[PDB]
Amino acid sequence: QPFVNLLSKATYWWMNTLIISAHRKPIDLKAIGKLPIAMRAVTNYVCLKEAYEEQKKKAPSIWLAMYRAFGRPILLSSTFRYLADLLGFAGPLCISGIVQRVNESKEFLENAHVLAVLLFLALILQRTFLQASYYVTIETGINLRGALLAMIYNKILRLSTSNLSMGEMTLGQINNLVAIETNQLMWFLFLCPNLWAMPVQIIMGVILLYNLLGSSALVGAAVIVLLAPIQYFIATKLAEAQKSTLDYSTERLKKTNEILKGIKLLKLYAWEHIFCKSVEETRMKELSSLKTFALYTSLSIFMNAAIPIAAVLATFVTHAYASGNNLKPAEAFASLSLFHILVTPLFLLSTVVRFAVKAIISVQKLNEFLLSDEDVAIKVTNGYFSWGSGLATLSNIDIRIPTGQLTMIVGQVGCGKSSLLLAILGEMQTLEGKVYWNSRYSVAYAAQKPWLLNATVEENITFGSSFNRQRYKAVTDACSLQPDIDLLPFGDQTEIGERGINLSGGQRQRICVARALYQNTNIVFLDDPFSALDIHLSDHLMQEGILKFLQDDKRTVVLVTHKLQYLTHADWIIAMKDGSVLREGTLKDIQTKDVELYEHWKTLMNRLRTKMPWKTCWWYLTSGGFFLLFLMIFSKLLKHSVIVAIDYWLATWTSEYQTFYVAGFSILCGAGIFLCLVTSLTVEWMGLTAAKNLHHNLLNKIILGPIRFFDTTPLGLILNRFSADTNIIDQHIPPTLESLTRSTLLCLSAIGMISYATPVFLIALAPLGVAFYFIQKYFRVASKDLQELDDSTQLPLLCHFSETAEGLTTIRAFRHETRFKQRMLELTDTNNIAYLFLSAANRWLEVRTDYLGACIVLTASIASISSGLVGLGLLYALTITNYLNWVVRNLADLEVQMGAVKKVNSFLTMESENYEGTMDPSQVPEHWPQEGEIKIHDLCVRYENNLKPVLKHVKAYIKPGQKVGICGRTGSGKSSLSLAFFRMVDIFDGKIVIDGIDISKLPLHTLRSRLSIILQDPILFSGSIRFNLDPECKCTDDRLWEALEIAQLKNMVKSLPGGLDATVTEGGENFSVGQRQLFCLARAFVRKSSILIMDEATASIDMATENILQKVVMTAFADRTVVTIAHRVHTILTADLVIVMKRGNILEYDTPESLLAQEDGVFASFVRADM
């Protein structure tokens, strides 16, 4: 009975139920059993950590720990591999025996049928052992992958966060370790038994070949063995080319992500075309590298499929012209079978050695990484904290935060404000002075830089807490997100953060503040919650979010803002400057003790089944051009015909049992070499052409789309169309298609030859055909499904790792390390289950196909028994066993990847906007905004069809060169009205007349080129400062410098390294918010347009900076007309005409003095609120 369990485990019957069935119902993690307690990431991690700790006590090297953790399975797998290899070497011997016995006490052992039965049994045993080895090694490799992921995740949680240690590039290295390093180490562990087996297989094969064919065997073995060093050389060249391609791909991906993450600015500036051209240039560089890589892949395939032919040629010619006897058929076919046996190990030994080198470097990298550095609410005495480099960033720190009372700390930009919080949390290094709390309890913390979980908004706000409707609603209302969440595609469940629907900086800050408030933890550390928020939003938030909501819960609050106007509410105040606290006390106490501090603060105030998708497959094939497809298919057909002809020529030559045969064989070998060369070249060329043709139009169409598409569709899918799908099309498909074609042709040729040799074989072909059809049918669905699960469950794993390495401070301030560890384990287990069952399906198919092939070998042999043709048939029967499962697996992979091609193709057909317009090209003036006049008539605007009109028949006219400022409550249509001039939002009724031309009829690019707009949150694109100032590069440097002076950034630019070409980090992160805003103003200036639209430009600007910016703008653009959306009404007091928007209506339209004249005026009330 237990032998039945052993057979079930050897034949992977334990998964037949989930393969034969579960094609009707898709395979889901519910269907797949949870991982056995033995293989869970927890157990593997504890084992590997125990081994590593034993080593560390002995000291530690990761290799010895890995051995002590996963030796026994690897020894078992190597034993299985050796048994499989030895049994497999019984093929050629059996063929030789059968052939010799045919056509005319150990007598029984010589009987032909006995040899046939022995061959069949040996084949089934070899395949069973080989697949058992594969599965044991795969299982051990996946266990190791789980352990390593858990280990590096624990290290990530225990990181240091100092910029000396972590800096900014370290996150990239951490993501690399989680993604590529661990996978490469896992794959080395997958393939390691090859290092044990392949050299021994080569040795045994060459020994048998010598025993069969004297010195000719030595000659052939030398020629063949020359295939290992050549393969290693070509593999090195391929690795170099693929590293270059990877670098160019990462560059292109960063450029694309920048383009489609700030698409609104590009479209408004009409820069989309320039950035797309730059991305296309990077694509051309990537395609040059990819063409080199494809050329070397073609040469690798050529060598793989040719050097064996040259070796056979040398062996047999040397035997013919050296060996006295002729070529007995048995010897010839045994030699051919041995060469077929040795072709795979030699072509793969170079790959396993390269994998071993990559694993050694990966383990060195991991070893390097693991050593990376690591009434009174709170009391600090003689605090002295350092970031790690030994320099005392904070000195003489002594604070006392009252419990249950609001505390605010104030200082200059860069006065040890944000660092003090991290020091309190322990992230900093405590040189001297202990910190004593009421060991620490969880403390809610909203980092200065907002951090967002990729999960939905509801999850981010809740953040692992007991979802309570009342508290959730109260927080969301206090945070002013109730209408903003409704705006997003899903009211309460839309994706957020990287790889989700992008949000404005204000929205991110609001989400983070909501998360901090929602938690029940008593201590709360808020760091610049108002920086991104508008003035109205901040006022609303503090009026009740801080003063009411928190005080209702009697929670200690530590708010870090430079907005002094709210100091009146502070119960305790701490002044920090130059890393030292000026004083700590109440407002009145501080003022009495420090009159100078009060004066400084006042001055600062200044006041069901899915079939194979043939259609997409055919479209991909024809993408290269019908001629290229015809050349590929015809060349492959001719190549395989010539190879079969070589084998048949050998068969006839043996049956003859000489100079006339030598010449024929040599000529056919030459033809085979040439046709292999041609076939490889053509297939790779078709692959390259298809990749280029798809990607070019893909990117062009995506950029040409409409804004709402980016507004709703998550950025994850859009950027996945370029990151993974294009990678698949460029690299994975062409190889898979080539493998499929070659394997199908070889299988068909073998079937044909076997049938020709023994036409009776066709009788047994039918049951074998049916069995193969059923195996193909069931596997091609089970695989597809399991790969779907693997990818869909591997996305969240890397998302979790990335979002953990990001915002360590939040994780360790909430003290939610354990919960995140548990989630990491629960995700890595799921991913490993999916991958493990994918490999189990592969083993299932391989074993069933190997038994099918063993049946084929048995039937072909039995037919042959009842003179060289028998040997030829047996040889091809043996090769069918090798090639059948590869046909099936390549077909499955081709289907899966053509799915990605289909996705890209569907994205290739998308809506757009009528850039052409209708106005006469000659009609437009040379300088259209010459006068700058603006006139409107009953304008009506709606963001999307069937939605509520944002603007309600607003009618307005601006005289040339006038200056008008617009204000109003949030969601009153200010931003939409500003964007109206650019037709970023559809207009139902009314029109906008500028310079006597209705914009509606103008070409979109022409309209959006001659207008200058400054968004609320400034975004600056990576590249040179010149590039940001004018990508078209059509401005003399003098204009750039004049603009920089106008922006007041001339001094900073001069201080820049290159001055005029200083490097700019992605998104303008290099500079400050004020510097970025000034640079955006300069960007607007260079356009030399007469109309400027400032949509809440100075939201993050300070009072003095805002005033100086406004005055310099007015002086510089005195002639030009400007429309400004006022962040604060006080900024637009000196305006020619004032407009206030309320619920999409311009209630007030008159001069600022006239508007202020009205009693209880809305604007007048706003001014009082600001004051």
Ligand SMILES: CCOc1cc(CC(=O)N[C@@H](CC(C)C)c2ccccc2N2CCCCC2)ccc1C(=O)O
């Ligand atoms: C994730 C599973 O991956 C496997 C992993 C294994 C373990 C293994 O010794 N591979 C040998 C192949 C054998 C036939 C020589 C090998 C060696 C060098 C380079 C690639 C490869 N192989 C890479 C995978 C498939 C192509 C040849 C077996 C089989 C598989 C499999 O696909 O089922």
Ligand SMILES: Nc1ncnc2c1ncn2[C@@H]1O[C@H](COP(=O)(O)OP(=O)(O)OP(=O)(O)O)[C@@H](O)[C@H]1O
């Ligand atoms: N994590 C860090 N890595 C490297 N240098 C740091 C780090 N944190 C602080 N510093 C340096 O130590 C000093 C203290 O920073 P401080 O607390 O003043 O930042 P902050 O000005 O409060 O934050 P922000 O300017 O974003 O409001 C600064 O001069 C800063 O450059």
Ligand SMILES: Nc1ncnc2c1ncn2[C@@H]1O[C@H](COP(=O)(O)OP(=O)(O)O)[C@@H](O)[C@H]1O
């Ligand atoms: N992308 C969008 N899709 C649909 N409606 C939008 C979109 N953006 C804004 N709105 C709607 O337009 C109104 C005004 O928004 P907006 O002009 O952006 O802010 P403001 O009120 O500051 O002008 C809001 O009530 C909002 O619901």
Ligand SMILES: [Mg+2]
């Ligand atoms: Mg800060």
Ligand SMILES: [Mg+2]
């Ligand atoms: Mg707005």
